[PDB]
Amino acid sequence: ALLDNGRRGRAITGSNKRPLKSLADMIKGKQGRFRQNLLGKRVDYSGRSV
Amino acid sequence: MKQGLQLRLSQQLAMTPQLQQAIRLLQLSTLELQQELQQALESNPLLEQIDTH
């Protein structure tokens, strides 16, 4: 469960009926390091408006 | 009449104390009590604590 929750058997959940996030969850996915922090990021000296 | 160390069969009236056990739990605060409960859980396989996982 610590290494990869839900891969083998049934995922261990918390008090909110939501499975906990493991190391693999942080590594991979659309919310992982590669796609959320390394291939794109938020920057300084930027603004937006209409 | 004599002062010696001996092994013998005698008939005696014996007194004994009966207090000390489970009295240490009163002085402990809640955090130390929980720590001691965790230490007791580790050694006793038949003790468990309620979990929500």
Side-chain angles (χ1 to χ4, degrees), chain B residues 3-53:
Chain B
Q3 318 179 81
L5 314 179
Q6 294 159 352
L7 320 173
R8 53 180 61 260
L9 322 169
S10 297
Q11 302 178 160
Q12 299 164 355
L13 316 176
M15 299 68 179
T16 170
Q18 70 289 348
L19 260 303
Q20 180 168 0
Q21 24 63 50
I23 315 295
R24 45 174 284 96
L25 294 182
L26 302 182
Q27 185 180 348
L28 305 176
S29 58
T30 310
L31 308 175
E32 301 174 353
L33 183 58
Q34 285 291 348
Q35 292 177 319
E36 184 158 335
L37 289 187
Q38 173 71 20
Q39 277 296 329
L41 290 168
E42 282 189 4
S43 299
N44 197 319
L46 277 77
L47 269 173
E48 68 174 357
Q49 211 166 16
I50 282 80
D51 63 324
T52 57
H53 290 353

Side-chain angles (χ1 to χ4, degrees), chain A residues 5-48:
Chain A
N5 193 20
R7 170 169 293 274
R8 164 58 168 78
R10 48 184 180 264
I12 297 182
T13 175
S15 60
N16 316 337
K17 285 187 173 184
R18 189 71 69 261
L20 308 183
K21 283 188 55 178
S22 51
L23 303 166
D25 286 321
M26 274 110 63
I27 288 301
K28 68 177 166 52
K30 197 181 180 302
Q31 312 289 337
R33 283 299 173 281
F34 282 106
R35 298 187 60 179
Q36 194 77 6
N37 299 114
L38 292 176
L39 295 172
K41 47 189 69 178
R42 296 188 177 270
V43 292
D44 285 320
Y45 306 95
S46 50
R48 82 179 302 103

